[PDB]
Structure formats: C-alpha cells, structure tokens
C-alpha cells in the first residue's frame, strides 16, 4: 500500500556495484592484501554484488513488462523471476557463511596466535571460499525451486535467529576480555549492519506465518517495499566500513585516482 520509485533501486544497485568493484580491484592490484583473512572481505563483496545486480535487473524487467513494448510468453516471466529471486537467496546464505568464516578466522588468530600461518594458509582459505560458494549455490536454488512450502521460511528464520545469537555471544565476549582489543572489532560492526538491515524484513515473515489476518500485522506488512530498500543499504555500507577501518586499503584507493 506504499510504493517507491524504481530510480531508488537502480541507483543504489549501481552505486554498490561500483563500490564492490573498487574493493576487489584494490585487493588484486595490491601485493600486501593477500592474507587469507582479506579474501573473505572479497567474497562478501561478491555477495553484495549479487544482491545489487539482481535487484536492479528485476526492477528493469518489471518496468519493461509494465510498459507497452513487448509480450513475454508468460512462462518466460515466471522463469526470469525465479532466476532473479534466486541470486538473492544465494547472496544471503553466502553472506551468513562468510560472516561466520571471518569470525572463526579472527577467533583463531586471536586465541591461537602461534601457528595461524601454519594452519590457515592462502590456498586453504581459497579452498574454503570456493567450497562455501559451491554449497551456498545449491542451498539457494533448492529453496527457491521449492519456495511454495512453509519449511523454507521457517528454516530461514532459524538461520537468522541462530546467527543473531552468535552475534550476541560475540558482543558479550567483547566486553569481558577474560590484539583482541582491536582484532574482532571489525566483525562486530559487519555483524551489526547485517542484522540491522535484514531484521525488518525477517520478522515480516514470522508474522504472515503466524498472524496473517490481524489488523495489526496487516498494516505492518503493508510497508513491504521499504524493507527492501534497507536490504540494499547493507551493500552500500559494507564496503565503506572496510575503507574507514583498514589502513592499507585506503592507501591503495589513492593509487586508484593517481
């Protein structure tokens, strides 16, 4: 019952795409940002790229079909919807898994800071990254090809809720110390932006599964299209936190302009 002009979706998508392109090109063009913990921040950039590209393309297609220009063999629209609605179910499980991997790597380097170079090497990190993306690819397709059911929604709910518990545990550990003072402060922000942005949408579908026909909930979901602009704003914020908290990445950006 509320609407948002498509220009918002398109602009946010393009801007976040440019930011993530800059992050990945900066990592590759540099020779010191090749540590295995700095590749997970590239995999996260890829996940946010997926969200932005899919949303921009879906908006373009909806606006094109709405206008008086083509006819699209109804099966075909229902097919590209599932293509587009499936590079967001992948770029959610991938984001969750990558945040877990970053947190586990930081915990290993903070509490086991003796053989981190022996155990967590560059090649092993690459193997973990490719395994995570391969697994999340299947996870995000099985769900969307089987979305008519009710188990997928509740499974997503428990995934988000459990990762919320992990964030809370990490925070309560942050205030009781007994490298660490400044180590896990990044993954504390990156886990506090993902939750702040994917939370309004996520309880939106604990409601429709609990209180569909109820005059309170009904006027809650009625603002659905503005819980999706928040999902983009997680992808326009994440690359900024890397810039304002990692030093040598900033100096690389200076090389980008000159």
């Amino acid at each position: 019952q509320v609407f948002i002009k498509p220009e918002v979706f398109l602009s946010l998508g393009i801007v976040s795409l440019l930011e993530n392109i800059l992050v990945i090109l900066a990592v590759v063009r540099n020779g010191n940002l090749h540590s295995p913990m700095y590749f997970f921040l590239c995999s996260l950039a890829v996940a946010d790229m997926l969200v932005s590209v899919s949303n921009a393309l879906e908006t373009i297609m909806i606006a094109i079909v709405h206008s008086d220009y083509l006819t699209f063999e109804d099966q075909f629209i229902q097919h590209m919807d599932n293509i587009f609605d499936s590079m967001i179910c992948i770029s959610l499980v991938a984001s969750i898994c990558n945040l877990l991997a970053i947190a586990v790597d930081r915990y290993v380097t903070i509490f086991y800071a003796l053989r981190y170079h022996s155990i967590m090497t560059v090649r092993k990190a690459l193997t973990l990254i490719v395994a995570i993306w391969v697994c999340c690819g299947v996870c995000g397709v099985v769900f969307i090809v089987y979305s008519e059911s009710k188990m997928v929604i509740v499974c997503l709910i428990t995934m988000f809720f459990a990762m919320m518990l992990l964030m809370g545990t990490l925070y309560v550990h942050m205030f009781l110390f007994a490298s660490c003072m400044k180590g896990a402060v990044t993954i504390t922000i990156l886990l506090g932006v993902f939750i702040f942005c994917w939370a309004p949408f996520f309880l939106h579908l604990v409601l429709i599964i609990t209180c569909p026909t109820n005059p309170y909930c009904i006027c809650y979901t009625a603002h659905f299209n503005t819980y999706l602009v928040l999902i983009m704003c997680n992808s326009v914020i994440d690359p900024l936190i890397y810039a304002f908290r990692s030093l040598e990445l900033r100096n690389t950006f200076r090389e980008i302009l000159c």
């Binding site: 879906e58 297609m61 609605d85 929604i153 949408f201 299209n225």
Partner: peptide, 7 residues
C-alpha cells in the same frame, strides 16, 4: 513477477 519474495 514482483519485487522480492513472500510479499
């Protein structure tokens, strides 16, 4: 089609 899913 429509934006997001489970709207």
């Amino acid at each position: 089609l429509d934006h997001x899913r489970w709207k």
